[PDB]
């Protein structure tokens, strides 16, 4: 309990070869905002529905830098539905 030790060697044990490659596998980026900011009322749902609203917004923007740059893009094919 409260154990960082086995939590650390579990950091070494579980981690994926993310150090060893590019971005093309999981596609999860660490954002700059902590989103514990600008929430004045924890009870407010749409306050951090705004916060994460712009968090997946901006995340997927810069990730569109990625995926124009990684040459698999985002946008759902609207030519095909299946």
């Amino acid at each position: 309990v409260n154990n960082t030790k086995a939590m650390k060697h579990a950091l070494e044990r579980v981690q994926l070869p993310w150090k060893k490659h590019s971005f093309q596998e999981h596609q999860s980026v660490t954002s700059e905002t902590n989103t514990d900011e600008h929430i004045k009322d924890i009870y407010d749902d749409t306050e951090r529905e705004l916060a994460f609203y712009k968090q997946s917004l901006d995340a997927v923007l810069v990730a569109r830098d990625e995926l124009k740059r990684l040459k698999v893009p985002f946008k759902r094919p609207l030519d095909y539905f299946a």
Partner: protein, 212 residues
Amino acid sequence: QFMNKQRTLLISSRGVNYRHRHLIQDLSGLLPHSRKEPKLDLQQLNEIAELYNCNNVLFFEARKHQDLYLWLSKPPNGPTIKFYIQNLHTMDELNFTGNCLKGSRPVLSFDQRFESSPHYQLIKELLVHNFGVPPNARKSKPFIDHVMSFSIVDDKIWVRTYEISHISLVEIGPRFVMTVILILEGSFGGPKIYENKQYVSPNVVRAQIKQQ
């Protein structure tokens, strides 16, 4: 081929609901690299990982048709995040409008605060493996469809998904309110490695109410 490869076993407990069944609908159809199995104590799971040969394991507990504990690990080694869900918003709500092409690999938004403690680094990792769709999981389609995020609301920590409209979005989900109850040694084994006392199991709050 590909660096990252996952498969996930999907088994919940007895005493299922439409909160439950709606959830197994979503999450089962969300993980195109996952295997889906009948429902079933604590030992045999890592062995089912041997039979169907699966590298990612999770489990949905039902107590009194209330407590949903998600056990989480990657067998036999794990380790496990024992988990509890509240305020479940699945995909099936009227105000979640989406219709998502199948099998896609989302893009995950998440807060940098997790790394500030190592256990959130590990729920980070184990979830990146388990729910992260390895490109490209067989049955999928290329490009991208939806975004899924996770982060901390007073250590009660949502995950969500938006369908993208070419960048606009409207939430797919399942909108999900996450906790971390206790981390255990391996996959379904060992002493309790990390606890959050923040959580008080609703059975326990009943144990308070009875005493007036």
